[PDB]
C-alpha cells in the first residue's frame, strides 16, 4: 500500500543505498550512455562477423543468414564439446538447451547431460555469453551449428562436423567466432559503420545532458570507457547534439563539461586491480602526449584524482564484473547495473499478466484436490491434466520472452545471470536515465528476498522432533 | 486465498517434487531420527570438550565456562587470523562480527576486513561452522577468545595471545577446539553418556515408527549413517521403544523391521564418491563378518545402495541433517532451528507490522520529489528506529540472529539450503501431514523487479 | 666382442622379438614406404601453412620466413601461455627453453617455470610437438614468436602481443598455426603439390619392392594409413616405378600385388579402438562401393582378415601410439619404429667421437681431484675450469644436432620422445629398410638399460646400515 | 680407467650434484637413522597383522604362517580382483604373475591379463606395495590366497572364496590385510615391542653420529619424521648410545645437540603441500604445549621448514627412504636392498658371463645372414639355456627377483627411483666416503643405439 512510482520509472534495489552520501557519479558509455539502437546494433555486429568468417574460408551459405533478435537471451552457456547453447541457473542445472535451432528435451538431455548439471567453472570447455555485445555471436552459434547440421556437404560428428578430410571440432569453430567478432570489434569496420550512420545505431535523448547536470550540481562526475578518444569523442558529441544545453532555452555546451573527469583507454577490467600507467590525451589529434582526457589508470587514481572514498562512488554501467580483489585491496565501489532487457521484461509482467493469473489459480486448485489428505490417506488423485496444462501456460510465458525465455528466470527457477545480478548490482534498471525521476537525498531501500517459508507463512499468530524439546 | 497446512507442520519447497515419484526413501540418523535435546545435548558436547582441553593443558577458568544456547547461530564462519566469528552473506559480505562476546560496529569492520568482505574459498583461514554438532564449539570458541583477552596473565594481540614466552594463534587455538571436539565424538565419553541417559539427551515420538511403516507401504526405507552398529542399535532400539507398533494396538516390532537396508560405518562423504569396501555386519558382535532381510551393510557407496535397492537417483528422496556439496537423488533436509523461527515470525509480527509502517513512512516523505527536487526531509530518526527494530528483529533469534537472515540480508546458510534441499522442514515428521501422492511446488523467490511491481517511454531504456 | 652389423644397417632392439613368429608385416604409408625428402617436403608445408595465415589476415612479413632445418627437433613443447618451446625429459624437467629464437637460460627459466617443471598433461595449454609433419610448424611458432616480439607494430605481452587494439593471446595464434596446417594437409594443396613433383619430395629406392616380395614369402604383408586411394595409389606407383620386378631382369608387377590387404581411410588412432564402418574402394573411380581395397574398418577386422594374432603383427610405422585400451581388448600388436633422425644421430656418434671422448677424460681427471677425499677431507679443489669445459663441450656436442640439440637426449638426460620410444617400440632403426639385413628366423635380443650402479660396478669381486643386520 | 670407491661404499648418481651447493640435510627417521634389523623387523610386523587379523575372526591356521624373507620383493602390485602379485616394469607390462605361491607361465597369464598389461593408475584395482614397511604384507597376501586356495572348507573362485554363504572377495580380504597393518603401526604392540628390545631390532652403528656431526659443520641439519616424540626419543637415544661423541674420547651428547631443527608429527606427505599448523612439543611430558635449540617441533610444512632454516629448495638435500610422487629438493634415496643386490652382481658374475657368451654365439651363427637367406639354424637348444640361466640369475634375488629388473626389463620402482631420485646407495652412511666438495656426475642410462654402437646410404634412412 505504500507509495511507488510507476514501473518503467522504477530504480530496483538489491542492497539498501543512501544517495545522499554519493560524492561522485561514474560512468561507462557503451550501453550505457551510448544506448546502442536494437535490433539494428546486433545485425551490423552479426554482417560484420559472419563477411569476417567468410572472409577466412567458411561457406557461402553464410551470407544468406539474418540476424534474428527473437532468439537469443543474454547469459547463455556456449558447450564447445557438443555445441549446444544452454540456459542454466545459479548453480549449473540445466534449464534449456538448444544444439542449433534444435531444442533439447528432459530425457534426452541427460544422454549428454549426467544429472542436467554443468561444472560452469571449466572455462576450458563452457564460454559465458554474459554481455549485449555477445548477443549477435550467440545467435551466430546457432546459426552455424544449424547450418553445418543440416548441410549435406557435412557430416555431423558428436563433437564437430566432417567437411570432406578436414573435421572441425565446435571448440575450433567457436574459436574462429570468438576471434572473428573480436577482430570485427578491434580492427574491422564496426566502429566506422556506427559513427557514419549515428542516427541508425546509437540513441538519442535529451534527459541525458539533463541528469547528468543535475549530478553535477550534487558531486563530482566522471567516464572511464574502455574505447579511445577519438571514438569517444563521435559518439559523446553525438549525444548531446542538441540546439541547447541542460533545459530548453539554455546555451549548448560541450559534451566534455559535463565531466569532472575523463578517461578513455580504460582497458577494464584489468583497470580495477593494477590498471596502465596514467596517460593524457592531445585533444587536438587524439593522440598521447578542468580540461583533461586520461588515458589508461586504474581505480585507485582516479579515486585519489577526484578525492573520493570508494563507498562514495555510485558506478553506472552494464558490465557485470567478478569479486576478484575486493578481499584484499580496499575502496570498493557501489554499483547501478543498467539493464535493458527490463523495459520488455515489465512489459510481459504486466501485459501477460494473463498467463500468471492462470498459472496461480491452477495452483490455489492443487492445493484444493489435497487439502484433506494426508500421509494416512490412499488417494491419488488424477492431475496429469493440470500439470500438462501448467507445463504448456509455463511454456507460453516463457516464450513471451523470445525462444531462449527470459533474462532472469526460467520457469520457477532463476538463471546463472540473475544471480550475478543480485551479487553484483547494489542498484538496477532499464536505463541510469531513471535517477531522474529520485531525488538525490533518496533512501533506496533494499526489497525482500523472501525464502518459500517466508513468502508462504502469514504473521498472523507440537512435535519434539521438530522443537529439539 | 489457497488453501496450506497448518505453519508448524508444513514442508516448505525449494524445487518441485512429485512424491508418486519416490520409490526410496533413506534416511541419516544423527539429527534426524534420533534428535538430540537441546540444549541439554549441546551442553553435554560442551563440558567434554572444555574437560578435554583442560587435560591437554588449557587453563583452568575453562571449567567456569557455561554452555549459552541463546549465544550461537549455526553456520559462522571463524576466521582463524583475527580470532572472529563472523556471519556473512551468499557473497562474503560481513553481516556480523563478534570478537569474544564484543560484537563490533560497522566503521571498525573495515580496519580488519576491507570492503567488509571475506574470501569464504581461502579455506586454510576460514573455518565454516555448518553443523548442529558444531554449535558447542561455535560458542566455546568465543568463550575462550573472551577468557584469553580479558585475563591479565595474556598479552592480547592482533592474531593470537602471548603467554609470557609462548605465542598461541587463533589459529593453534582453533586446531586444538577442533581436535578436541573430533576426540570427544571418536574416542572420548560423548556416546557412552549419551547411551546411558537416553532419555535426557534423545528425542523420542511415536509419530516416527507410524511415518516410517507408511512409507514402507509405498516403497523402499534405508539407513545410511556414520555411526557404527553399536551405537545405532542402541539409538534405534530407544527411538522405536514403545509397547506396541506402529498404531497403538498393533504388536511392537524390531527397529530393523522397518527399513529394506540398513547401513553404518557410510564414511560420508566419501560414500558418495568411490566410497570404501562393502562390508557386513555380525549384528550379534557387532563386528564386521570376514565375508559378505536381516543384514547390516557397513562401508560401501551411494552407488552400491542404489544397485542393491534397485534404484535410480531421481527415484530417491534423502532425508537428513546435513548439506553435502555438488562436486541424483532427491533432498529433503531438516532444519531444526525452523520450530523456533517460525515463532518468531509469527509471535513478533508487530516489530514486522511496524517495519513495514516506517517503510511505508518513507515513501510517503519523498513520494513528490525526483531529480530536480531540492528537499532533503529530515530522515535520521526513522533511519533511527528502522534500526533500533531491525536489531531488536533480530535478537529474537538469539545474539547472532537468524539462521537464514540478518536484517534484511540472506545467510550464506540460506543459500546453501536453497542451493541444496529440494525440500526442507523442521523435521522430516511433518511429511505425516502430506499424502505420498502429493505435487510438492516451487515456492518463487522474487526479484526486486517482481515482488514490487504489479501485474495490472525513454528510448535509452528501450533500445527504441 | 660379439659380431654386429655394421651401425647405418642396424635394427635396434627395445623388446626381446623371435621373427620366426612374425606371420604378419603390417605398414603405414607417410614417413615409412614414402619418405618424403628433406628439408624440401618440410619448406613446402611450412610455404602453404605461411601462405594459409597470411591469406586469413596475419602480415606480409610472413613471407620473407624461410624454413630452417636447423632449428627444430621433434618431440618438443609448445606452452601456449607464454609462447615458449620446450624440450623436456621423461618426467617434465626442462633441458631447453626458447621464445622466439631467443634460448633462455638457467635462472631465468625460473621466472615462467618454477622448478623448471611442466605438468605435461595439461593438454590445454601444452602441445606435443611429436610427429614429421611438425617439423614445419615447430619452426613456424618460434618466427612468428620471433616476428611478433621484435616488430615495434606490436606491444609484447607475458601472455601474447597487441597489434594495436586488438590482444592476440599466444594461444590464439598457436590455434591459428594448428588449424592452418591441418587445412593444408586436409583442403589445400599439400597433395597436389607433392604429386606434381613426386621426384623432388619423395624417396624411390629400389630396396623396398626387394625387401617387401621377400617378406611375402614368409608371411603376409598388409597396408593401413590414412589416406585416401587416391593419393596412396600415386604415391606407391610412383615408389615402385622402375624397369623391374623385385630383382633385376624380373617383369615390373604393381605395387598392390605385393600386399595381401590394402586398407585406406584408416583414421588412426580410432582404427585400433572401435575404428568406422568397414568399406571397400571401386578401384577405378576410387569412390565407395585378391585385388580388393579396404576403406575404414579396425585393427580388429585387418586382425580377422588375415586370420591373425596380434603378437603374430609387426606393425611398422613412424607414429607413436598411447596405451589405451590395450589393458582392455586383447590383441595387441608388435611394433617396429622408423626414426629417421637416427641417421643423422649415428653420423654424430661416430663423427664427433672427440667430443664424448674429451667429456670422458674430464670425468676422469675430476675422480682423480677427488680420489684420496673423504668427509673428514676439508680440501675444496677448484672445478671451476672443469666445470667450465665440461659445459661449454655438453653444448658443442647438443648443437651437433642442431639447435634443440638430439632428439633423445640434452646432456645427460633422456628426453620425453626417447622415453616415448621405449614404451611403444619393439623395434626401431632409421628406416624399415634395414631388416633386408636381418634373416627372417632372426632373433632380435634387447638391449640392456643399466642402472648407475649396474654400469658403473664391475662384476669382478660392511655397516648393518647397508645390510640390516 | 676411471678411479672409483668400493662398491660398497658407493654413492650412485642418477643427477649431478654440486654437494658444495648443499646448505641443508634433512632426515627421514624410520628405515633411514633407524635402520630396522632384517629379517627380525618384519617377523614382528608380521606375526602382529596375524594376530589382529585372528582377533577380527580369521582362522586358527594363520598362526601356523611364519614369514619368509626369501619371497617378497618390494614394489609388487597387489590385483585385488583376481588376488595376484604382479612384478611390473616402467609401462605396466607384466613380469611376474603369483597366484598365491604359485607362479603363473606367461601363457596362462593372459587369460586373466589381456596383452600381459595392467593399467596401474586404477588405484581402486591394483594396490602397490612399495614401502619397506609393506614387506610383510605382501608375503601375508601369498600365504592367505594359498591358504584359502588350498583349504578344503573354501571354494575358489574368480575374485575371491566362498565360505559357505559367505562370500570374501580378494578385495575384501585386502582391505582386513590393510586395516590390520595399520592398526598394529598405529594402535597395536609394533612400537612398544620394538621399544622394550632395541638391539634385537634396530641397527646401532657409531659412523652414524660421526658422520652427522660432519654435516653440521658445513651446513644445517634437521630431522622431519612422521613418528611422535615419544617414540622418536627413545629411538634416537638408542641410535646415539655410545660411551663417546662423534669420535673415540670425545664426551658423548644428546642426539638433539646433532641437529638444528627437530620436526615430530610431520604428516607427510601432505607435510609437503599445506601442512598443518606448526607446534611446538613439550620434551619433558612429550605433548604439544598450548603455545608456541632446546625447541622441538611438531606438524607444520615443509614451506615453514625452510623459513626456520633461512633455506631455498635446491639448497636442501632431503635423505630419506620414501619416494613421493612429484604433484624443489634435492633427494637422496635410501635402498637397503642395494647392498644384497651388489653381492649378486659380483658373486654371481659367473652367470652374467655365460649369458653374454650364449649371446655372442648367437651373433655368430647368424653372422652370415641376411633376409635373401633361407637358413633357420637350429637355436631352440640355446634358447632354453638363456631362459634357464636368467631364471638362476633371478633367483639368487628371492623368488620374486631382483627389486630393479626382471630378467632383462626394468622393474616400475627402477623406474620410480630414477624419476624421483638425485642420488641413491645401500644407506645414507656412505656419504662418509665422500667430501663435501664432492661433485656428483650422472651416470648415463644408454639407449640401445647408444650401447651397441662404437664411436669410431639408403635415401629411405637419411631422408635424402
Given at each position: 500500500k505504500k507509495?511507488?512510482?510507476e514501473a518503467?520509472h522504477?530504480?530496483?534495489?538489491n542492497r ?6 554519493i560524492?561522485?557519479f561514474?560512468?561507462n558509455?557503451?550501453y550505457?550512455?551510448?544506448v546502442?539502437?536494437?535490433?539494428e546494433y546486433?545485425?551490423?555486429?552479426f554482417?560484420?562477423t ?5 572472409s577466412i574460408?567458411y561457406?557461402q551459405?553464410?551470407?544468406s543468414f539474418?540476424?534474428?533478435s ?7 552457456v556456449?558447450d564447445t564439446?557438443?555445441?549446444n547453447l ?7 542445472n540445466?534449464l534449456?538447451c538448444?544444439?542449433?535451432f534444435?531444442?533439447?528435451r528432459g ?9 542436467k548439471?554443468?561444472?560452469r567453472?571449466?572455462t576450458e ?15 551466430l ?9 543440416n548441410?549435406?556437404?557435412?557430416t555431423?560428428?558428436?563433437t ?6 578436414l573435421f572441425?571440432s565446435?571448440?575450433?569453430?567457436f574459436?574462429?567466432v570468438?576471434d572473428?567478432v ?6 574491422g569496420?564496426?566502429?566506422?559503420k ?14 541525458l545532458?539533463?541528469?547528468?547536470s543535475?549530478?553535477k550540481?550534487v558531486?563530482?562526475?566522471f ?5 579511445d578518444?577519438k571514438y569517444?569523442?563521435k559518439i559523446?558529441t553525438?549525444?548531446f ?12 555546451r560541450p559534451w566534455q563539461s559535463?565531466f569532472d573527469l575523463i578517461?578513455?583507454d580504460?582497458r577494464k577490467?584489468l ?5 596502465t ?8 589529434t587524439?593522440?598521447?602526449?578542468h580540461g583533461?582526457?586520461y ?6 587514481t ?8 570508494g563507498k ?9 564484473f567478478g569479486?576478484?580483489?575486493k ?7 557501489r554499483?547501478f547495473?543498467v539493464?535493458p532487457?527490463?523495459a520488455q ?6 501485459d501477460?499478466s494473463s498467463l ?6 491452477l495452483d490455489?486448485?492443487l492445493?484444493e484436490?489435497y487439502?484433506?489428505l494426508?500421509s494416512s490417506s490412499?488417494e491419488?488423485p488424477?492431475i496429469s491434466?493440470?500439470?500438462?496444462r ?11 520472452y ?10 520457477s527457477?532463476?538463471?546463472l545471470?540473475?544471480?550475478q545480478?543480485?551479487?553484483?548490482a547494489?542498484?538496477?534498471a532499464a ?5 531522474l ?6 533512501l533506496?531501500?533494499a526489497?525482500?528476498?523472501?525464502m518459500?517459508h517466508?513468502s508462504t507463512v502469514?504473521?498472523?499468530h507440537?512435535?519434539?522432533?521438530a522443537?529439539?524439546?
Amino acid at each position: 500500500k505504500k507509495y511507488r512510482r510507476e514501473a518503467y520509472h522504477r530504480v530496483f534495489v538489491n542492497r539498501s543505498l543512501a544517495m545522499e552520501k554519493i560524492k561522485c557519479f561514474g560512468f561507462n558509455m557503451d550501453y550505457t550512455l551510448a544506448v546502442y539502437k536494437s535490433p539494428e546494433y546486433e545485425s551490423l555486429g552479426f554482417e560484420l562477423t559472419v563477411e569476417r568468417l567468410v572472409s577466412i574460408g567458411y561457406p557461402q551459405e553464410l551470407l544468406s543468414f539474418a540476424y534474428d533478435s527473437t532468439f537469443p537471451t543474454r547469459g547463455l552457456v556456449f558447450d564447445t564439446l557438443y555445441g549446444n547453447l544452454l540456459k542454466v541457473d545459479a548453480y549449473g542445472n540445466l534449464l534449456v538447451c538448444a544444439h542449433g535451432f534444435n531444442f533439447i528435451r528432459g530425457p534426452e538431455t541427460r544422454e549428454q547431460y549426467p544429472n542436467k548439471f554443468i561444472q560452469r567453472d571449466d572455462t576450458e570447455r563452457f564460454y559465458i555469453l554474459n554481455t549485449l555485445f555477445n548477443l549477435p555471436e550467440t545467435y551466430l552459434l546457432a546459426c552455424l551449428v544449424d547450418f553445418f547440421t543440416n548441410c549435406p556437404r557435412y557430416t555431423s560428428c558428436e563433437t564437430g562436423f566432417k567437411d570432406g578430410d578436414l573435421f572441425m571440432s565446435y571448440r575450433s569453430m567457436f574459436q574462429d567466432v570468438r576471434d572473428a567478432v573480436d577482430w570485427v570489434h578491434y580492427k574491422g569496420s564496426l566502429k566506422e559503420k556506427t559513427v557514419e550512420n549515428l542516427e541508425k545505431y546509437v540513441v538519442k535523448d535529451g534527459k541525458l545532458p539533463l541528469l547528468l547536470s543535475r549530478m553535477k550540481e550534487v558531486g563530482k562526475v566522471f567516464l572511464a570507457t574502455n574505447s579511445d578518444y577519438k571514438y569517444t569523442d563521435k559518439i559523446m558529441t553525438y549525444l548531446f547534439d542538441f540546439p541547447h544545453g541542460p533545459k530548453p532555452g539554455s546555451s549548448h555546451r560541450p559534451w566534455q563539461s559535463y565531466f569532472d573527469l575523463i578517461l578513455v583507454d580504460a582497458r577494464k577490467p584489468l583497470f580495477f586491480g593494477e590498471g596502465t600507467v596514467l596517460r593524457q590525451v592531445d585533444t587536438k589529434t587524439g593522440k598521447l602526449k578542468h580540461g583533461i582526457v586520461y588515458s589508461g589508470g586504474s581505480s585507485d587514481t582516479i579515486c585519489d584524482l577526484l578525492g573520493a572514498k570508494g563507498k562514495d562512488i555510485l558506478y553506472i554501467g552494464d558490465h557485470i564484473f567478478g569479486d576478484i580483489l575486493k578481499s584484499k585491496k580496499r575502496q570498493g565501489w557501489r554499483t547501478f547495473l543498467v539493464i535493458p532487457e527490463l523495459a520488455q521484461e515489465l512489459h510481459v509482467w504486466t501485459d501477460k499478466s494473463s498467463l500468471f493469473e492462470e498459472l496461480q489459480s491452477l495452483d490455489i486448485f492443487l492445493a484444493e484436490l489435497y487439502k484433506h489428505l494426508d500421509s494416512s490417506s490412499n488417494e491419488r488423485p488424477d492431475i496429469s491434466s493440470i500439470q500438462r496444462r501448467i507445463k504448456k501456460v509455463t511454456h507460453d510465458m516463457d516464450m513471451c520472452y523470445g525462444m531462449m525465455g527470459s533474462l532472469f528466470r526460467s520457469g520457477s527457477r532463476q538463471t546463472l545471470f540473475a544471480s550475478q545480478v543480485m551479487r553484483y548490482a547494489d542498484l538496477y534498471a532499464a536505463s541510469f536515465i531513471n535517477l531522474l525521476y529520485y531525488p538525490f537525498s533518496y533512501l533506496f531501500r533494499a526489497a525482500h528476498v523472501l525464502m518459500p517459508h517466508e513468502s508462504t507463512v502469514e504473521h498472523t499468530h507440537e512435535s519434539p522432533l521438530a522443537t529439539r524439546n
